[PDB]
mmCIF file of C-alpha atoms in Angstrom:
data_model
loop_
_atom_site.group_PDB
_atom_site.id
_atom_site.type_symbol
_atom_site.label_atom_id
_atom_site.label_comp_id
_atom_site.label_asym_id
_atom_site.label_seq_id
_atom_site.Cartn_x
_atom_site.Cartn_y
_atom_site.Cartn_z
ATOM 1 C CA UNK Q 46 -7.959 25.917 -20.857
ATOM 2 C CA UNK Q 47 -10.379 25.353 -18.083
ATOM 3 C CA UNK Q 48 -9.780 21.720 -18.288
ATOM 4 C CA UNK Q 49 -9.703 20.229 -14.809
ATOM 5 C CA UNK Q 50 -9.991 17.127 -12.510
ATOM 6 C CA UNK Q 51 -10.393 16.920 -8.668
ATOM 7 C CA UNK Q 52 -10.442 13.551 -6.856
ATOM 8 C CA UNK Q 53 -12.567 14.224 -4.275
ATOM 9 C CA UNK Q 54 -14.097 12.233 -1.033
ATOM 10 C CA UNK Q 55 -17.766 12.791 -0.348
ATOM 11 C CA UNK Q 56 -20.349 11.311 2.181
ATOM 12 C CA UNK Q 57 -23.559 10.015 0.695
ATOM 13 C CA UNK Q 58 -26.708 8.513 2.795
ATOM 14 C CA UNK Q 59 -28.733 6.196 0.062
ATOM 15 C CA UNK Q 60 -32.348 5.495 1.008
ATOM 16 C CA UNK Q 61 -33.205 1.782 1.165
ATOM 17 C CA UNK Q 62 -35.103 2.064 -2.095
ATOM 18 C CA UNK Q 63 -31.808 1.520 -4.050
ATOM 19 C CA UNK Q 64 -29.845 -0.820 -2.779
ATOM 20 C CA UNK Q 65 -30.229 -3.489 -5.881
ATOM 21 C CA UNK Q 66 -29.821 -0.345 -7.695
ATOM 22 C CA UNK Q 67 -27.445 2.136 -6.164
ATOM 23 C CA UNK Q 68 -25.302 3.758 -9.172
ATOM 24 C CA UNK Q 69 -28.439 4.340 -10.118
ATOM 25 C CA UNK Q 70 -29.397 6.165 -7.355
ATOM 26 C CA UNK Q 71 -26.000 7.394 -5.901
ATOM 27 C CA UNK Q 72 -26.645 10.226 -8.240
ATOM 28 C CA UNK Q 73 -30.452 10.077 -8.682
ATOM 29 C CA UNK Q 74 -30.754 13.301 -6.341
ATOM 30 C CA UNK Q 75 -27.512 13.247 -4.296
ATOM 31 C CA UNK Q 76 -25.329 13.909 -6.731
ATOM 32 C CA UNK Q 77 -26.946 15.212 -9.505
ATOM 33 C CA UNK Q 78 -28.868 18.169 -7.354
ATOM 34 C CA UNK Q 79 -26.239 20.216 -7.926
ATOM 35 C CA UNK Q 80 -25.334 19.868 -11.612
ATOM 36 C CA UNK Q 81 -22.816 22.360 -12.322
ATOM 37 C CA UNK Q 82 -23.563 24.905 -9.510
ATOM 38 C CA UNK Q 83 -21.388 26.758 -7.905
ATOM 39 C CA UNK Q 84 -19.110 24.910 -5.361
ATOM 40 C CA UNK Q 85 -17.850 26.965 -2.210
ATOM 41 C CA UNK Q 86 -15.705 24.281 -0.750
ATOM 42 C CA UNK Q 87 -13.351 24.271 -3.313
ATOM 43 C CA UNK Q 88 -14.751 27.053 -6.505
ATOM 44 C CA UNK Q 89 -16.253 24.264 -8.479
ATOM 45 C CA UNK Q 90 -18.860 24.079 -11.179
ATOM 46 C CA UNK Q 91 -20.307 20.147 -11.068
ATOM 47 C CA UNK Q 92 -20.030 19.197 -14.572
ATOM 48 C CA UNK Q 93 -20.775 15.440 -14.325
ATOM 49 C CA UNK Q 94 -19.415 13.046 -11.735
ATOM 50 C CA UNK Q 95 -17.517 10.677 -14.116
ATOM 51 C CA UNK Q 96 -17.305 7.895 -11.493
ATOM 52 C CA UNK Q 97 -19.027 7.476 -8.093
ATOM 53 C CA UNK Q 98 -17.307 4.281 -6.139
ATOM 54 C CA UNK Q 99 -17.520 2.809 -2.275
ATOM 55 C CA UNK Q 100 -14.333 1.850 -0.837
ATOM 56 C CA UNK Q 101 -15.719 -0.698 1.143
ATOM 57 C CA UNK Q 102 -19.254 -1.505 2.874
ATOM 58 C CA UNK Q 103 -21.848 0.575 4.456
ATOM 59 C CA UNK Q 104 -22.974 1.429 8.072
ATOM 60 C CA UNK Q 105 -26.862 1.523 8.791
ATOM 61 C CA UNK Q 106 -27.121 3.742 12.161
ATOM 62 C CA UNK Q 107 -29.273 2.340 14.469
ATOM 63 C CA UNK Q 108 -32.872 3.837 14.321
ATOM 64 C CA UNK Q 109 -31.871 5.749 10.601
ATOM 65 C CA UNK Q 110 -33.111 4.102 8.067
ATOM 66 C CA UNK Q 111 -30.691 5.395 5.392
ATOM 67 C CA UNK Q 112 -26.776 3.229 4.621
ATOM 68 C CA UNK Q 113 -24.503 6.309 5.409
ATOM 69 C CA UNK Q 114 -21.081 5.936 2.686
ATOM 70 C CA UNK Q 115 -18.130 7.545 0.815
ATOM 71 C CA UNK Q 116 -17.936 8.252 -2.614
ATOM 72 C CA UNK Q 117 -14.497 8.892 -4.146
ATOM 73 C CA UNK Q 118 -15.953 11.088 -6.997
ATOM 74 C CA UNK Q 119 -13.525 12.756 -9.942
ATOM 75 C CA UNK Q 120 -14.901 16.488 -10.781
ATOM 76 C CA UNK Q 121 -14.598 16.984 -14.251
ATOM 77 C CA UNK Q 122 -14.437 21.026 -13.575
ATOM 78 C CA UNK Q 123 -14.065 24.404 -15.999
ATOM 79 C CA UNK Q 124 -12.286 26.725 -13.606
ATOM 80 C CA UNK Q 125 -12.126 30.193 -15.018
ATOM 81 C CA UNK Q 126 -9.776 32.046 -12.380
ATOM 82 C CA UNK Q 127 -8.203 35.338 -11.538
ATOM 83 C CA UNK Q 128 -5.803 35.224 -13.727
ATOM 84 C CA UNK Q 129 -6.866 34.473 -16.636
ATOM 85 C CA UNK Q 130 -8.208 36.555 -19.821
ATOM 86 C CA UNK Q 131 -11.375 34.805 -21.053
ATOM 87 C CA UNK Q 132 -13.347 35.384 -23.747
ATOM 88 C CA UNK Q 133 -17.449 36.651 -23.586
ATOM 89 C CA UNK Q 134 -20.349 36.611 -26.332
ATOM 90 C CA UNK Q 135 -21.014 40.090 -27.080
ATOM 91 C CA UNK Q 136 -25.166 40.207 -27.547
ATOM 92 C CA UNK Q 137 -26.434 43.353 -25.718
ATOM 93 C CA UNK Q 138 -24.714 46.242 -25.307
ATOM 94 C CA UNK Q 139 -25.649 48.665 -21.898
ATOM 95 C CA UNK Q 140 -24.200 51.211 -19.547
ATOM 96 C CA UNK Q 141 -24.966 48.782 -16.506
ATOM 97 C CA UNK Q 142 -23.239 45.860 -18.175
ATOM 98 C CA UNK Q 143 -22.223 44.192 -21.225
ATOM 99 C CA UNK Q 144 -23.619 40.488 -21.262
ATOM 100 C CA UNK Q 147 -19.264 31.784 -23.363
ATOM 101 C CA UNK Q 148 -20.295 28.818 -24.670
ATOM 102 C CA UNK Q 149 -23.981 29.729 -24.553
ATOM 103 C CA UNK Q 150 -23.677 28.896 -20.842
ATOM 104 C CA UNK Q 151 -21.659 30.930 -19.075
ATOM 105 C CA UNK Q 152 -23.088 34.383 -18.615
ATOM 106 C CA UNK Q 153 -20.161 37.258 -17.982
ATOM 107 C CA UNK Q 154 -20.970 40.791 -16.564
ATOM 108 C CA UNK Q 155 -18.992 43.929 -16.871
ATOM 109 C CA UNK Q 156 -20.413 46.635 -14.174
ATOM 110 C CA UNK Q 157 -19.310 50.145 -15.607
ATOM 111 C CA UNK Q 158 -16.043 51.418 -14.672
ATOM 112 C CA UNK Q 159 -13.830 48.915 -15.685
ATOM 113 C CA UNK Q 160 -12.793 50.012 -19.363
ATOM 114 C CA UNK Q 161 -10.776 52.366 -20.611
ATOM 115 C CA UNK Q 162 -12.317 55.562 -19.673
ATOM 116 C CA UNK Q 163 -10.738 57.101 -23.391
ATOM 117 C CA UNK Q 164 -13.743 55.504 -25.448
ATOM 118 C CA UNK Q 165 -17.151 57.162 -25.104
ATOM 119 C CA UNK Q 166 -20.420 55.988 -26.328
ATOM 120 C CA UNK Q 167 -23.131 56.078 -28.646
ATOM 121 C CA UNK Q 168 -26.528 54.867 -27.832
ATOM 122 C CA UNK Q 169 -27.436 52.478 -30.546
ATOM 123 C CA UNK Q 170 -23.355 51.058 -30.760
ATOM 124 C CA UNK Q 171 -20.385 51.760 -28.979
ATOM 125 C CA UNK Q 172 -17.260 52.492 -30.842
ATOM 126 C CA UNK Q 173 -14.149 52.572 -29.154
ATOM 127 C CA UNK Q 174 -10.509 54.285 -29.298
ATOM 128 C CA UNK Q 175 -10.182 53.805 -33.144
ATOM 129 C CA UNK Q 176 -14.103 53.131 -34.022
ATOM 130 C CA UNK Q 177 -13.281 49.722 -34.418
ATOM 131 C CA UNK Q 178 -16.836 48.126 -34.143
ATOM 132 C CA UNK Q 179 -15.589 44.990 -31.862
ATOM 133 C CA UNK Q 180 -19.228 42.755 -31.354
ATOM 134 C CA UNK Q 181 -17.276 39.208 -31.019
ATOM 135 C CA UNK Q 182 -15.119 36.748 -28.756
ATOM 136 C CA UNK Q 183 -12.515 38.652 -27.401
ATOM 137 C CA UNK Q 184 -10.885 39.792 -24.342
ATOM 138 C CA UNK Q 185 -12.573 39.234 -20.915
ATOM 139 C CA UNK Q 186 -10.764 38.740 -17.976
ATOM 140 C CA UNK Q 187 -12.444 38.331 -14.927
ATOM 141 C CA UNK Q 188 -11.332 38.343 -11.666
ATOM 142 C CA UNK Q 189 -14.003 39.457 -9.479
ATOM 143 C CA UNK Q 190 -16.196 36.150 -9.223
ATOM 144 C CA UNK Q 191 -19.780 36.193 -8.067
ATOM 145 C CA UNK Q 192 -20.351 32.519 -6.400
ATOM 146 C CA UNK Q 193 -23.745 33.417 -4.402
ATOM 147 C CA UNK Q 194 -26.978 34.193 -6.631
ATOM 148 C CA UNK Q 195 -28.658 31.102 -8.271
ATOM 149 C CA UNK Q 196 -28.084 32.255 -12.005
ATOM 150 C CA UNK Q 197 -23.830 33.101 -10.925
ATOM 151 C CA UNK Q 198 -21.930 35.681 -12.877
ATOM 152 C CA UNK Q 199 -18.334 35.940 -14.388
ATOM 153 C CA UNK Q 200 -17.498 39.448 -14.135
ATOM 154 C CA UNK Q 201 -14.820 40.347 -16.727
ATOM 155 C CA UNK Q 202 -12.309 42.863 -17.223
ATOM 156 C CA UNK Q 203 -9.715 43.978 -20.116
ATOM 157 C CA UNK Q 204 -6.645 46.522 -17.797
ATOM 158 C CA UNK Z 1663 -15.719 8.563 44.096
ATOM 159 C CA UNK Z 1664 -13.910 5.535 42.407
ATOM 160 C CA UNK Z 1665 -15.535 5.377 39.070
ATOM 161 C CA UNK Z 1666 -14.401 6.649 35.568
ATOM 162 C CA UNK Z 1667 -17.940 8.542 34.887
ATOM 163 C CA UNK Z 1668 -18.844 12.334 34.975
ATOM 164 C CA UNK Z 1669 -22.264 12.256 33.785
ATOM 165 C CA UNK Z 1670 -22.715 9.064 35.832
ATOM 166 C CA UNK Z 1671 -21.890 9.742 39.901
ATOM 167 C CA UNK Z 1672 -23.540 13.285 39.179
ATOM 168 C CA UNK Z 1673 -26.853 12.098 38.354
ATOM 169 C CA UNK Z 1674 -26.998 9.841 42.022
ATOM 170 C CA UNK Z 1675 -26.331 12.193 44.303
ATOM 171 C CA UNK Z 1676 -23.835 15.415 45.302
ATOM 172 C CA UNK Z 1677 -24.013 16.348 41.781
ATOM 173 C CA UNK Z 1678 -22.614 19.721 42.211
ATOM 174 C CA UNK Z 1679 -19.765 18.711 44.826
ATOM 175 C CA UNK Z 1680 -19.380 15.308 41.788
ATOM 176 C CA UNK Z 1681 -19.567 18.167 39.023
ATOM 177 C CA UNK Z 1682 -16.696 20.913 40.845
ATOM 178 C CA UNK Z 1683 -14.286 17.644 40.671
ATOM 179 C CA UNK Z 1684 -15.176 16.808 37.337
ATOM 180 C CA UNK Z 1685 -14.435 20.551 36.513
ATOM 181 C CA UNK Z 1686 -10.938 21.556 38.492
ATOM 182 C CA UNK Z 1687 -9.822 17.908 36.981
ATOM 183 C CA UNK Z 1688 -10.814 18.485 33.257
ATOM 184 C CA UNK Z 1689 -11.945 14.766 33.913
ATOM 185 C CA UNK Z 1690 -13.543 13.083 30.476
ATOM 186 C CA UNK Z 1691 -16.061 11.045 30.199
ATOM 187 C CA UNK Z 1692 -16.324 7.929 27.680
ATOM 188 C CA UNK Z 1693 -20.259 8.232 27.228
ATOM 189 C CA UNK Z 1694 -20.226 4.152 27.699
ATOM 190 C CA UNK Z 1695 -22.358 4.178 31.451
ATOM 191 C CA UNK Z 1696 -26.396 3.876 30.528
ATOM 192 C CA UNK Z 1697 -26.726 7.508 32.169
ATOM 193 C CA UNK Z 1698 -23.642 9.078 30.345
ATOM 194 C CA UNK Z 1699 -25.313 7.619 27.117
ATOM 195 C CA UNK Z 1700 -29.503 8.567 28.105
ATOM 196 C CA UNK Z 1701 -27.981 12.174 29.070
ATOM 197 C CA UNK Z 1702 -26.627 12.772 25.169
ATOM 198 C CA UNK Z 1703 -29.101 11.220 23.425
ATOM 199 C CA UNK Z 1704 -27.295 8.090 22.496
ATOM 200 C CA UNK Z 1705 -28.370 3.939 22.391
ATOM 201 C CA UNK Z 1706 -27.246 2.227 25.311
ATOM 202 C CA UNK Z 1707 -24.226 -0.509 25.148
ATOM 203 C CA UNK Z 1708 -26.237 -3.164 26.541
ATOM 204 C CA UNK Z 1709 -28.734 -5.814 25.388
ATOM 205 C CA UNK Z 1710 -29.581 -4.814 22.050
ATOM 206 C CA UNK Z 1711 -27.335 -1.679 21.496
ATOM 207 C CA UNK Z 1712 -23.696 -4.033 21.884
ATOM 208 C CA UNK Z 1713 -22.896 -4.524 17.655
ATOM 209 C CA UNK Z 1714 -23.206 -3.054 14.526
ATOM 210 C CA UNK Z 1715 -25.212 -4.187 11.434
ATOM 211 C CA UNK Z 1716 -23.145 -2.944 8.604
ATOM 212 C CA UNK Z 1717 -25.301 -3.439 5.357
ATOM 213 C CA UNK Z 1718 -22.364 -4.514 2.430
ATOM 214 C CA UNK Z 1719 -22.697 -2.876 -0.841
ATOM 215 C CA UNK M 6 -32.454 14.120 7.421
ATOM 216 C CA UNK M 7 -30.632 13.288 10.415
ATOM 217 C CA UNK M 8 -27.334 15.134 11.352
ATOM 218 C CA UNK M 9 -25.756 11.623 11.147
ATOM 219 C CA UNK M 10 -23.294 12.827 13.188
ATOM 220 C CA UNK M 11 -22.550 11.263 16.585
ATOM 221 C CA UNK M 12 -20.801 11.819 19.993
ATOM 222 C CA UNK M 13 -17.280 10.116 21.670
ATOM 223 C CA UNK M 14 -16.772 11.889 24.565
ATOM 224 C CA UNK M 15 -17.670 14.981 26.928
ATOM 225 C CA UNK M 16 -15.223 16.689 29.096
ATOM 226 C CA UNK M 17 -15.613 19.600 31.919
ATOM 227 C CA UNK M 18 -13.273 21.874 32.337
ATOM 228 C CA UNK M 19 -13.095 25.561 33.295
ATOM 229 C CA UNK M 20 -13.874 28.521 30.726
ATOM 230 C CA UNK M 21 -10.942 30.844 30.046
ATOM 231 C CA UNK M 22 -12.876 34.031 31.090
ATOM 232 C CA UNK M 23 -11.849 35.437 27.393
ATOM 233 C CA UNK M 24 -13.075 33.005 25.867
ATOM 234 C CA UNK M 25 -16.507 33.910 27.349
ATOM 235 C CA UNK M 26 -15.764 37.280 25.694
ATOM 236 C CA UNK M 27 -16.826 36.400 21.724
ATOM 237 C CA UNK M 28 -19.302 33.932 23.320
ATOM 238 C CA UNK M 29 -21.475 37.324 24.127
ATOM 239 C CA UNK M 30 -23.717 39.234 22.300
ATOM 240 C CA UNK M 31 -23.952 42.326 24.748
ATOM 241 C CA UNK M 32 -23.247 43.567 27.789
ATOM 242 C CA UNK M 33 -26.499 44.010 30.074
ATOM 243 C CA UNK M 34 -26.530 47.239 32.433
ATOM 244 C CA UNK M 35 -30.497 47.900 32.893
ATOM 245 C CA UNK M 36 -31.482 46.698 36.471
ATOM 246 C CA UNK M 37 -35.421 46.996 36.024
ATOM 247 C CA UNK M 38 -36.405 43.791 33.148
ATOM 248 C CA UNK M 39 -40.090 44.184 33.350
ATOM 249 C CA UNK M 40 -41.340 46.525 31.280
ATOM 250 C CA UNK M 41 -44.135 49.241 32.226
ATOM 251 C CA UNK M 42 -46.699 46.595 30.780
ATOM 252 C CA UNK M 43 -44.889 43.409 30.739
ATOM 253 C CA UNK M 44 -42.346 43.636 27.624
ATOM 254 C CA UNK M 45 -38.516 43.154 27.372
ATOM 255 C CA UNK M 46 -37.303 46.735 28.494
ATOM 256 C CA UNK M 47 -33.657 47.361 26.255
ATOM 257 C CA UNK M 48 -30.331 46.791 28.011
ATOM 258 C CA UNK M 49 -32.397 44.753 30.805
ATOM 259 C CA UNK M 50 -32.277 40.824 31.551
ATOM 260 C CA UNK M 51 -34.828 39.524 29.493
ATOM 261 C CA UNK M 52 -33.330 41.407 25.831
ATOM 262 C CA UNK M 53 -34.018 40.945 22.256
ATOM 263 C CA UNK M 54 -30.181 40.271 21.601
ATOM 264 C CA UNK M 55 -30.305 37.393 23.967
ATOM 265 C CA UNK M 56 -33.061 35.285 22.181
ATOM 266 C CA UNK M 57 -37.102 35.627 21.986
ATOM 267 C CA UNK M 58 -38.001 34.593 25.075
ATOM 268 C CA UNK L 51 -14.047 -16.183 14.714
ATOM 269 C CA UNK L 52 -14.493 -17.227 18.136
ATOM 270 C CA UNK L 53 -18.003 -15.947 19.308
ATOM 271 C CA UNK L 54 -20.709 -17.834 19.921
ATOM 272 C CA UNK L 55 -22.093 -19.278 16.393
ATOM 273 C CA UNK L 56 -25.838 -18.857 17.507
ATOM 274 C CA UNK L 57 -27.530 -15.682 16.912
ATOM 275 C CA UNK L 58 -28.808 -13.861 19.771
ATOM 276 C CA UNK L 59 -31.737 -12.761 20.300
ATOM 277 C CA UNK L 60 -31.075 -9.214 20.795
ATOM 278 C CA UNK L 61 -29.006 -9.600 17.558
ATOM 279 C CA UNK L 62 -32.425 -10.751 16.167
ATOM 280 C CA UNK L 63 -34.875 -8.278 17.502
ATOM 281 C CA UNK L 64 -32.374 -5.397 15.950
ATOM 282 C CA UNK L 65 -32.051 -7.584 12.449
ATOM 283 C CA UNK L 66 -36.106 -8.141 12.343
ATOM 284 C CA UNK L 67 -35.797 -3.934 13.120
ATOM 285 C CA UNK L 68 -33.654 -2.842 10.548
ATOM 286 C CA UNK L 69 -34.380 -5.206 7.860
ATOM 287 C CA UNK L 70 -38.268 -3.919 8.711
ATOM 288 C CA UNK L 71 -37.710 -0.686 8.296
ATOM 289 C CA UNK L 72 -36.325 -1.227 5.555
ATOM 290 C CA UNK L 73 -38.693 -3.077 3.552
ATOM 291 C CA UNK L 74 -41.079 -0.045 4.854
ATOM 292 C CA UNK L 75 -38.826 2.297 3.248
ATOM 293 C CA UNK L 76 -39.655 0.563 0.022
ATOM 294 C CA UNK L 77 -37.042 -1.742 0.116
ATOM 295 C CA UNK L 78 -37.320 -4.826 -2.428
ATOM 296 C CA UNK L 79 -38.695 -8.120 -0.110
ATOM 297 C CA UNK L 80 -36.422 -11.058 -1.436
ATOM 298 C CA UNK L 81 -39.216 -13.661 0.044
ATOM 299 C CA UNK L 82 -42.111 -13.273 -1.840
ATOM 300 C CA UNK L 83 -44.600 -12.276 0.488
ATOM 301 C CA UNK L 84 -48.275 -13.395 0.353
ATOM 302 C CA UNK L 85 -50.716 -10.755 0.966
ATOM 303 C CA UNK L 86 -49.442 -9.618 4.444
ATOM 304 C CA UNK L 87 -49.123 -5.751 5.167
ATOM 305 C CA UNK L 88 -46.616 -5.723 8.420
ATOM 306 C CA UNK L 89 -43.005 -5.061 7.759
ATOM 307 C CA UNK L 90 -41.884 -7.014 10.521
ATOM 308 C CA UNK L 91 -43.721 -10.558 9.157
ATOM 309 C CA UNK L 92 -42.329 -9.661 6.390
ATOM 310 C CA UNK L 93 -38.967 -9.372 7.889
ATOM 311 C CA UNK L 94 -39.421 -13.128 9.637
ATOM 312 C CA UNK L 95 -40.036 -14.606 6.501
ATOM 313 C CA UNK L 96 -37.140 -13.573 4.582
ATOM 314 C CA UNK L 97 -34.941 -14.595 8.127
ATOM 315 C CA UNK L 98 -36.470 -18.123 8.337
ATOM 316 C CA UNK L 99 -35.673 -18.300 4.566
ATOM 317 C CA UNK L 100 -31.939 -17.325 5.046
ATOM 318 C CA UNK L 101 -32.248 -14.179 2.564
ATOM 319 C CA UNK L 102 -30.503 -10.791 4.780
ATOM 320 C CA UNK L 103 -27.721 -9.655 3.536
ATOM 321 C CA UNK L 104 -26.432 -7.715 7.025
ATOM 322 C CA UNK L 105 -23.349 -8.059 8.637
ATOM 323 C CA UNK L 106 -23.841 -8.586 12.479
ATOM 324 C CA UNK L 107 -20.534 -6.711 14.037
ATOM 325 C CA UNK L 108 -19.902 -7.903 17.316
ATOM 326 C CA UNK L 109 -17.946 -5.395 19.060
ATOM 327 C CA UNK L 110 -15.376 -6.756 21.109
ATOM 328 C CA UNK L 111 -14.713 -4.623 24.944
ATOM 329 C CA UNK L 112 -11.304 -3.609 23.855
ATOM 330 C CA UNK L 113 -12.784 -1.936 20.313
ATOM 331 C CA UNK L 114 -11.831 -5.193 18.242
ATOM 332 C CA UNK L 115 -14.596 -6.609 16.311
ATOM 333 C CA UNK L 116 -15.645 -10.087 14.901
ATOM 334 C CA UNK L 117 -18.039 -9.399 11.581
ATOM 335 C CA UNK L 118 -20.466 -12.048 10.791
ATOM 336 C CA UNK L 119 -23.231 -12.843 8.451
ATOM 337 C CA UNK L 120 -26.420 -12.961 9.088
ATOM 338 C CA UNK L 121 -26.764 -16.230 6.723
ATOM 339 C CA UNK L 122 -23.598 -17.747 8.784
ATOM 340 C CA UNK L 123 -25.407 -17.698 11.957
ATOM 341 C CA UNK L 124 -27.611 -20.417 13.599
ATOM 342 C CA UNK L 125 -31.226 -18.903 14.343
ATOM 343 C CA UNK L 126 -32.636 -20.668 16.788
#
């Protein structure tokens, strides 16, 4: 289950336009700009930041504009690892690929199943021409983390 | 010669006899002297650069 | 957007000599800089591995 | 606690500063201003009304500090 949480510190400079309303705009962009995208400090896709709080005060610097502060944010966070043998929605079946949830999109570059099954262009039937076009294995291990629309390349050895 | 400033006592005068000291002593500076804190780009810590403002949330 | 961050502190002290080494991006060996017509001439002073100048 | 219970006046030139660049940020003015277009004004009417919520932090020259209010602080 990809269930997880992170407690996490961040540092967050609010603009002087919301400081009657800051909850408000503690998230407005600074939060909220990268709405389940791919984190590289710590592999994490930004679900929604369940609370955003200030230990204490805030420290205007000088000629900046801007109140500079911490937010002690929990990730709510789906972390499909290596590992792990996921699931993908079977749509479109290709040679270069074969492409959860309706939101995560899975890849499968070519060799990387069983080399026993061949294939037919309109359907591929494997070992026992089981016709297999649903949730099943997918375990991926080699993560892309880089391009804007990510990938979750799976595997089934 | 007595003073606890790199950056300052280099930009008077000697500054490269002031700079081999501050070099073969690893001597650190504080960045508190008005030169020390003009030469990094910092607010001096005098007149109205001594206190923070510290907006409360 | 500022870089927010600030400064405590400078200290001189003496680079290790391979320590330099890593903070180089080639070794220069071309005594003649100026080019024919003015331009960087490769392996010289003035490179394009050491910045546009 | 044992400072001075005046306000400087460096410590209000960088108030009248901040609190201006603030309300030129689009900050909300607290002192309902009456058809003037300088942030700093601005800034002098909401100190002679008492309304800036800033905490003045007067550093100390051993790094201990004394934080005060800009409300608890006799402008002159």
């Amino acid at each position: 289950s990809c269930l997880v949480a992170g407690p996490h510190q961040r540092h967050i400079a609010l603009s002087p336009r919301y400081l009657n309303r800051k909850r408000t705009g503690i998230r407005e962009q600074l939060d909220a700009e990268l709405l389940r995208y791919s984190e590289s400090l710590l592999g994490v896709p930004i679900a929604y930041d369940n609370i955003k709080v200030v230990g204490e005060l805030g420290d205007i610097y000088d000629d900046q504009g801007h109140i500079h502060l911490n937010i002690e944010a929990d990730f709510v966070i789906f972390c499909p690892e290596p590992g792990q043998k996921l699931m993908g929605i079977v749509n479109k079946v290709s040679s270069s690929h074969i492409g959860v949830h309706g939101c995560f999109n899975a890849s499968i570059p070519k060799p990387e199943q069983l080399s026993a099954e061949q294939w037919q262009t309109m359907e591929i039937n494997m070992g026992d021409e089981l016709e297999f076009e649903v949730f099943r294995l997918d375990s991926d291990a080699a993560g892309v983390f880089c391009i804007r629309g990510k990938l979750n390349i799976t595997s089934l050895q | 010669r007595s003073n606890s400033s790199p950056l300052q006592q280099m930009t008077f005068e000697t500054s490269f006899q002031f700079l081999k000291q501050a070099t073969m002593l690893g001597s650190h500076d504080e960045l508190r002297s008005p030169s020390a804190c003009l030469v990094v780009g910092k607010v001096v810590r005098g007149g109205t650069g001594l206190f923070e403002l510290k907006q409360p949330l | 957007n500022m870089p927010w961050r600030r400064l405590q502190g400078i200290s001189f002290g003496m680079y290790s000599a391979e320590e330099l080494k890593k903070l180089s991006v080639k070794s220069i060996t071309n005594p003649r800089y100026l080019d024919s017509l003015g331009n960087p001439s490769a392996n010289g002073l003035y490179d394009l591995a050491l910045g546009p100048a | 606690r044992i400072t001075t219970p005046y306000m400087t006046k460096y410590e209000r030139a960088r108030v009248l500063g901040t609190r201006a660049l603030q309300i030129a940020m689009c900050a909300p003015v607290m002192v309902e201003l009456e058809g003037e277009t300088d942030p700093l004004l601005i800034a002098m009417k909401e100190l002679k009304a008492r309304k800036i919520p800033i905490i003045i932090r007067r550093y100390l020259p051993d790094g201990s500090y004394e934080d005060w209010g800009v409300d608890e602080l006799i402008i002159t």
